[PDB]
Amino acid sequence: NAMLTGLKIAVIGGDARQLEIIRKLTEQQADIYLVGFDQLDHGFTGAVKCNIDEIPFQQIDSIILPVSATTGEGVVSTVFSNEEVVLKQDHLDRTPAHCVIFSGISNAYLENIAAQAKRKLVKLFERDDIAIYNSIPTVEGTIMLAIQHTDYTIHGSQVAVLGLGRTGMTIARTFAALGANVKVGARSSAHLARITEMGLVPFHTDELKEHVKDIDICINTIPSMILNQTVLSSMTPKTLILDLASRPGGTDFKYAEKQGIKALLAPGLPGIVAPKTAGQILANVLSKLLAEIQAEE
Amino acid sequence: NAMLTGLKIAVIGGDARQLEIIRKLTEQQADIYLVGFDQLDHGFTGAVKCNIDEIPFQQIDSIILPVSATTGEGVVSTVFSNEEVVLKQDHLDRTPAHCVIFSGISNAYLENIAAQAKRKLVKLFERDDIAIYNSIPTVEGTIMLAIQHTDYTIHGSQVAVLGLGRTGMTIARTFAALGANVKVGARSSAHLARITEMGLVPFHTDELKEHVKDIDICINTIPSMILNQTVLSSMTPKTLILDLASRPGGTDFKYAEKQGIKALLAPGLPGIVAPKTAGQILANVLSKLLAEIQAEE
Amino acid sequence: AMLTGLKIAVIGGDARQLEIIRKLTEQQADIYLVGFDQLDHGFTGAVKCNIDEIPFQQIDSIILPVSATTGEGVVSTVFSNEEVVLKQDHLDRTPAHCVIFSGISNAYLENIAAQAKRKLVKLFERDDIAIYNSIPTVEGTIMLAIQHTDYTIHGSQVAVLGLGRTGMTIARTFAALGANVKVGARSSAHLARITEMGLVPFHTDELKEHVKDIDICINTIPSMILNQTVLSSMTPKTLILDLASRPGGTDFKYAEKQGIKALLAPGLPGIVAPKTAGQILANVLSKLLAEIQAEE
Amino acid sequence: NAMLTGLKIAVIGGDARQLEIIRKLTEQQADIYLVGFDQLDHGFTGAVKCNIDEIPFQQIDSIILPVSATTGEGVVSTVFSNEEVVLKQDHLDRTPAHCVIFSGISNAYLENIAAQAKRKLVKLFERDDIAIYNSIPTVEGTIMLAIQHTDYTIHGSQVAVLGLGRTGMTIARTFAALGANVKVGARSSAHLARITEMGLVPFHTDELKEHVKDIDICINTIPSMILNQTVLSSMTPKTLILDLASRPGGTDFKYAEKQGIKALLAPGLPGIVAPKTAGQILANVLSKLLAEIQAEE
Numbered sequence A, B, D: 001n002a003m004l005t006g007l008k009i010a011v012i013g014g015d016a017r018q019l020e021i022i023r024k025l026t027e028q029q030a031d032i033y034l035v036g037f038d039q040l041d042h043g044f045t046g047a048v049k050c051n052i053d054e055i056p057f058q059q060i061d062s063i064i065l066p067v068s069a070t071t072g073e074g075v076v077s078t079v080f081s082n083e084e085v086v087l088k089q090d091h092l093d094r095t096p097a098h099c100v101i102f103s104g105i106s107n108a109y110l111e112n113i114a115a116q117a118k119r120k121l122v123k124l125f126e127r128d129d130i131a132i133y134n135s136i137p138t139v140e141g142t143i144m145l146a147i148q149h150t151d152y153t154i155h156g157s158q159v160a161v162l163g164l165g166r167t168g169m170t171i172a173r174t175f176a177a178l179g180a181n182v183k184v185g186a187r188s189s190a191h192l193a194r195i196t197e198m199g200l201v202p203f204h205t206d207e208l209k210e211h212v213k214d215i216d217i218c219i220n221t222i223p224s225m226i227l228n229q230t231v232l233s234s235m236t237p238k239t240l241i242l243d244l245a246s247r248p249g250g251t252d253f254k255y256a257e258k259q260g261i262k263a264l265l266a267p268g269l270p271g272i273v274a275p276k277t278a279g280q281i282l283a284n285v286l287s288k289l290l291a292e293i294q295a296e297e
Numbered sequence C: 001a002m003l004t005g006l007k008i009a010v011i012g013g014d015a016r017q018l019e020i021i022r023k024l025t026e027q028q029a030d031i032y033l034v035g036f037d038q039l040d041h042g043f044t045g046a047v048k049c050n051i052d053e054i055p056f057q058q059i060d061s062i063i064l065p066v067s068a069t070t071g072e073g074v075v076s077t078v079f080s081n082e083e084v085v086l087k088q089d090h091l092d093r094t095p096a097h098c099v100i101f102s103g104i105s106n107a108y109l110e111n112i113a114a115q116a117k118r119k120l121v122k123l124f125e126r127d128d129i130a131i132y133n134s135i136p137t138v139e140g141t142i143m144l145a146i147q148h149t150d151y152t153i154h155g156s157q158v159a160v161l162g163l164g165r166t167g168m169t170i171a172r173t174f175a176a177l178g179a180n181v182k183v184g185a186r187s188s189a190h191l192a193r194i195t196e197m198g199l200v201p202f203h204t205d206e207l208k209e210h211v212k213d214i215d216i217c218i219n220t221i222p223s224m225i226l227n228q229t230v231l232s233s234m235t236p237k238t239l240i241l242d243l244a245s246r247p248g249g250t251d252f253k254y255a256e257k258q259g260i261k262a263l264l265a266p267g268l269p270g271i272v273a274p275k276t277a278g279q280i281l282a283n284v285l286s287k288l289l290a291e292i293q294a295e296e
C-alpha cells in the first residue's frame, strides 16, 4: 500500500542483508541499481546490474552502502561479486542536492567525501530504533554463545548483564525469561528502578567487584573499560564473559586470558546469526526514510 | 549498615505512607520531630510527637512534607491529628543553609516560601526513579479497576495502553503477563521498536482512531487529549477507558459520557491501593538523598 | 459444527445458563426451556414450557444449573416465580443415550440418574472446565489479594499450595505479576514442574517451615493443611486465601484466635467474571453435545 | 545435611554425567567403588578406582550404571577407560537382597539379568521428574538447533509445538518466552485448555495439515507418525522441523527430504548440550532415592 515509485536508488555492495533491502525496495517499485552482485542470481525483477562508473549519479536520489561502509582506501565490501568496488569523491559530486547516503556505522573517509560533496549521510546504526530492533538478533546471538561455551543450562544459572541501554534491556529481559537468575548493573537511579520493576536484581556498577565474585555468565553492554583488572581479580575461571560492547569492548582481555577466564568479544552478532532479520530491519527503516525524501519532491 | 545518625529531621504531617518513611529513618537512627500525629496510636524509636512551634528549626537538616504539601493558606494535611497544622514562612527562615525540604507534587505556596527562604525544595514525584517504582502500585490499581468494571476476564481480552513512558511500559508489560492481547500506541520510533521487542503490538498514535475501534479496555498514559471526540466517535460502549494521565487526563469525558462510554480518571492510585508500598518507595529514595546531605558536613 | 437434529431441555439456571442457551441456539439445536417464564426475551428455536410438558422420550440431553438441585429435588431457577422439581420419572421416560449435564456434586441427582440408568456428567469435575475456570479464578484471587492488603503483589512473598489444575494457573500468574512465588506440592513431578517454571518448590511436609514469613498464602488443596500447628508459626502479617471447596483447607476458627485474616472464596469465576464463566460452560457443552450427536 | 554415610555403592562406567553423580554421592559421604575411570585425570573423596572383579558385591547396597546401561553382550559404556568393562549375571547374584540397580533407559540384557538375579532395577528416564527436569536442558538444545539452522530470529516467527506432554510444556513455554508466536497441537480437551491458559494458540492434531501451512519452525514431541506425507505435502521448503521424539521420531524424513524440507532428529540433547546439568539432574534424583534405601535397609 505504501510506494516508492519515482525514486531511483543505487545499492552499492553488501551481504545477505542487502538482499532484504533490495527485495523491499523492488516490492515498493523503486528504480534500482545494483553494484557488487554480478555473480548472484538474486531473482530480483527489474533491477539493473552494473559497475560504479556506469551508474547515472545525476538522477540518483539515494545511495545505500553496506553496514560497515568503506575501508581506508574506500573500497566497498561485496560478497556476490569478484570485481573490487571503490567509492570515490567524484561519484558523490555527480549527485543531486537532495541525495541522501545511508550506511551502518561511522567512517572518517565516508564522512569526509560526504561533507565535501555537501550530501547528507545517515548513520543507521546510530538511530534508536535500529539499535533496539537489532538487540533482538543480538540476544539470540548471545544465547547461542552461552549455550555453546558452557556445559550447563542457562536456566537456573547466575547471570549478570552490565548496563541497561537499548540492548542491555533486551539481554536482561530475555535471559530472565529463559529462566536464569538475572542481575543487572547500572548507574542511573532510573535504570535501577526499572531493573527492579522488571523483576530482576539491581546493583550499582561501583559494586561490580562484589556482584560478579560468583556468577556463571557475565554479559557486557558498557562501551568502556568496566571489567578491569581489579574486578577480574575477584572472579574464578567458572565465569564466561560475553562482551558485546564495540571494540575494544569492555574487558581487560589479556588479564582474563592469564587468569584462565574465557572472555569473548563478539562483534556483529545480528549479521552473523540472523541476516534475514538483520536485513529486514534495515529494509524497514530505510523504506520509512526514503518515503519522506519522496514526499518532499 | 548504611546509617543516618548525625541528622536532625522534621516530619510534618502525612498519610499512612509517611508511616513507612519515619519507619526507615528511625531504623537509620535519625533524630526526628513528628507534628500532625497526636491521634496515632503509637510512637517510633528516636522521634518525639510535638507542635511545629516546638521544633528547633535552627538545627533541622531536612523537612519532610506530605505528597501534596500544602493547601493555599499554609495548612499541612494531617490524617493523624485533630489539631490544624499550618507551615509558615518564618519556619523555613529559622533553618540552616543546607536544609532540604522534601515533598511530592508541586504546590504554589510551598515553592514561594521555600525559594523566598533561600532553601532547596525537592519535589520527589518529578524524579524518574520515583515515577518508575510508583508505576508498579499503579498497575495493581489499574488491574483492580479493570476487574471490577468488567464482566469478562482480562486474560484473552483486547487491551490498548497509550504511551510507553515510564509508567506505560509497566502497564503494558503487566497486562501482557496476565494474558490480555496488548497493543500499545506511541509516537517515537524507539518506543515503537521497543513495543515490538517486548512482544506487544505497536501502533502510531496518529492511527489511534483505527486501533481502538474494537478493544475491551483502553488504558491511557499520555498527558494530552488524544481520546478526543473524533477517536471516541468510532469506539463502542463496550469499551472501558481507564485514564491515568494527570488532571485533566487524556480524554473528552463529557463526550464519552454522551456516547455511553465508561471512561474513568484515576488519580493517586499508589496512595489508594498500596499505601505501604507507596510509602516504602518514598522512604527508600528519601534515605538515599539524606545520606548525600549527611555526606556534605 | 451444528446441533441441527438435537432435542435439548435446559432446566433452571442463572446468568450462565443464558450464555449456554445463546450458544446452543446459535447451533440450531431444538431447545425446551423450563424455569424461564419470568424472562422476557426468547431464544431462536426454543419453546418455554413446564417440566410436565416436555417429550422426554425424545430428549437427547438435559442441562441443569451449576448447583444441580436441593435434597427435595427442586431445581434452582432465577428466571421463574414458579417452583420446578426434577423427579425419577422424568429421567426414566428419557432415552438410553440421553446425558444429564450438571456442574457440581449432588446426592439426590446422582441417585435418580443412577436409578434411571442415565449418564450424569458433572462438568466442574472435568479437567478442561477446571483449567478454563482457573483463569477467572486467578483474577478473583488477585482481586482479593489487592483489596485485602496495603502492599503490592510485586515483590511480595507468595505461597501457593498444590500444583493441581488451578494451582498451576495461580502460581504462573502470580509470578508473572512479579511476586516471589514458592509452591508446595508432594509428588516429585509437581516439584520438578515448579522448578522448571522458575519458581521455588517445597514439599508440603515442610509446610510449617515455609510459611513462617510469607505475605499471602493461597490454598488449592482440598484437605486440611493450614492447621492449628502450622498456623501457630505464621503471624497476622500473613493473609490466607483458601480457594478449596468447603470446608476448605484451613482451621479458620484458629486463624481467628491468632488474628490471621483467612478467607474462604467459593465460586469466584461466577462472581468475578460471569460472562466468561458462562462461555466456558457454553463452549464445552457444545463440544460435548456434538459428540452425542455423532453417534445417532 | 541429608547424608549417605553408611552406604556402599558401585559406580560402573559412564559419561561426564557420571562425574556429577559421583561428586554428589561423595559429598554425601557414601562409600564408592568406581569402575570405568582409570583414565580420569583426578579422583574423588571416599571412592576408589578399581576393576569390576575387585568390587565386593556381596556388600554393595547399590549399583549405578550409565544412561544407556549396557550392550547385548553386557559391555558397559566407558568414556574414561581403555579397558573393556563387562557386567556378568554372577556379579548381581553375589549382591545382597535389598540391593537396587540404577540405569537410564531400558535395555534387555540388563533387564534380563536383573530379573533373573531377583534384584530391583530402576530405569530413571521412565520417571516423571527426570523427564521434566530434562525438558529444560532439552529446550536449550532445541533453541540452539533453531538458531543454528535459520537465517531469521526466533522472536517474531511462527512456531508450532506438537504435544503438551512433559517436554512439550517446557518447549512451548520457552519458545513463547523467546518471543515467537507459538501454536501448539494436542488432542486432549485438558491440554488444549492448558495451552489456552498459557496464553498460546491451541489446535487439535486432527487439524495438523491446516495449522502448519505457514510455520517457520515445527517442533514435534509426539512419539507417533504425525508429521506424515499428507501433512508434509501442504508444507513449504521454508519450514524447519525439529523432531525431539525417540527414534524414529514422528516424521517421514524420507518424504521431507524429497520435498526440500529440512527435518532433524535430535537424540539425547541434555547429554550433548548441558552434561553438567544432565548429571546434576540425575544425581539429585539418585540422592533422594538412595536415601529411601538407607532408611529401609
Ligand SMILES: NC(=O)c1ccc[n+]([C@@H]2O[C@H](COP(=O)([O-])OP(=O)(O)OC[C@H]3O[C@@H](n4cnc5c(N)ncnc54)[C@H](OP(=O)(O)O)[C@@H]3O)[C@@H](O)[C@H]2O)c1
Pocket (backbone or CB within 6 Å): A131, A134, A135, A138, A163, A164, A165, A166, A167, A168, A185, A186, A187, A188, A191, A205, A221, A222, A223, A224, A226, A243, A244, A245, A246, A266, A267, A268, A269, A270
Ligand atoms: N556485538 C554486537 O553485534 C552488538 C550489537 C548491538 C550493540 N553493540 C554494542 O554494544 C554497546 C551497547 O550499546 P547499546 O546499543 O545497548 O546502547 P546504549 O543505550 O548506549 O547502551 C549503553 C548503556 O550503558 C550505560 N553505561 C555506560 N557507562 C556506564 C557505567 N560506567 N556504569 C553503568 N552503566 C553505564 C549507559 O547508561 P547511562 O545513562 O547510565 O550512562 C547506557 O545506557 C555499543 O557499543 C554497541 O555498539 C554490539
Ligand SMILES: NC(=O)c1ccc[n+]([C@@H]2O[C@H](COP(=O)([O-])OP(=O)(O)OC[C@H]3O[C@@H](n4cnc5c(N)ncnc54)[C@H](OP(=O)(O)O)[C@@H]3O)[C@@H](O)[C@H]2O)c1
Pocket (backbone or CB within 6 Å): B131, B134, B135, B138, B141, B163, B164, B165, B166, B167, B168, B186, B187, B188, B205, B221, B222, B223, B224, B226, B244, B245, B246, B266, B267, B268, B269, B270
Ligand atoms: N493516577 C496515578 O496512579 C498516576 C501515577 C503515576 C503517573 N501518573 C500520570 O501518568 C502520566 C504518565 O507519565 P509517566 O510518569 O508514566 O511517564 P511519562 O514519561 O511522562 O509518559 C508520557 C509518555 O507519553 C508520550 N507522549 C506524550 N505526548 C504524546 C502525544 N501527544 N502523542 C503520543 N504520545 C505522547 C511520551 O513519549 P515521547 O517521549 O515521544 O514524547 C512519553 O513517553 C503522567 O501524566 C502522570 O501524571 C498518574
Ligand SMILES: NC(=O)c1ccc[n+]([C@@H]2O[C@H](COP(=O)([O-])OP(=O)(O)OC[C@H]3O[C@@H](n4cnc5c(N)ncnc54)[C@H](OP(=O)(O)O)[C@@H]3O)[C@@H](O)[C@H]2O)c1
Pocket (backbone or CB within 6 Å): C130, C133, C134, C137, C161, C162, C163, C164, C165, C166, C167, C184, C185, C186, C187, C190, C204, C220, C221, C222, C223, C225, C243, C244, C245, C265, C266, C267, C268, C269
Ligand atoms: N472457590 C473457587 O472459586 C474455586 C475455583 C476453582 C476450583 N476450586 C476448588 O479448589 C480445589 C482445586 O483443585 P483443582 O481444580 O486445582 O484441581 P486438582 O487437580 O484437584 O488440584 C489439587 C491438587 O492438590 C494436590 N494435593 C491434594 N492433597 C495434597 C496434599 N495433602 N499435599 C500436597 N498436595 C496435595 C494434588 O496433587 P497430588 O498429585 O500430589 O495428589 C492436586 O494436584 C478443588 O477443591 C476445587 O473444587 C475453587
Ligand SMILES: NC(=O)c1ccc[n+]([C@@H]2O[C@H](COP(=O)([O-])OP(=O)(O)OC[C@H]3O[C@@H](n4cnc5c(N)ncnc54)[C@H](OP(=O)(O)O)[C@@H]3O)[C@@H](O)[C@H]2O)c1
Pocket (backbone or CB within 6 Å): D131, D134, D135, D138, D162, D163, D164, D165, D166, D167, D168, D185, D186, D187, D188, D205, D221, D222, D223, D224, D243, D244, D245, D246, D266, D267, D268, D269, D270
Ligand atoms: N531428543 C531428546 O533430547 C529427548 C529428550 C526428552 C524426550 N525425548 C523424547 O520425546 C518424547 C517426548 O515425550 P515427553 O517426555 O515429553 O513426555 P510425554 O508426556 O509422553 O509427551 C508426549 C505427549 O504427547 C501426547 N501425545 C501422544 N501421542 C499423541 C498423538 N498421537 N497425538 C497428539 N498428541 C499425542 C501425549 O498426550 P496424550 O495424553 O493425549 O496421549 C503426551 O502428553 C519421548 O518419546 C522422548 O523419548 C527426546
Ligand SMILES: [Cl-]
Pocket (backbone or CB within 6 Å): A187, A188, A189, A190
Ligand atoms: Cl541519578
Ligand SMILES: [Cl-]
Pocket (backbone or CB within 6 Å): B187, B188, B189, B190
Ligand atoms: Cl522519532
Ligand SMILES: [Cl-]
Pocket (backbone or CB within 6 Å): C186, C187, C188, C189
Ligand atoms: Cl512420587
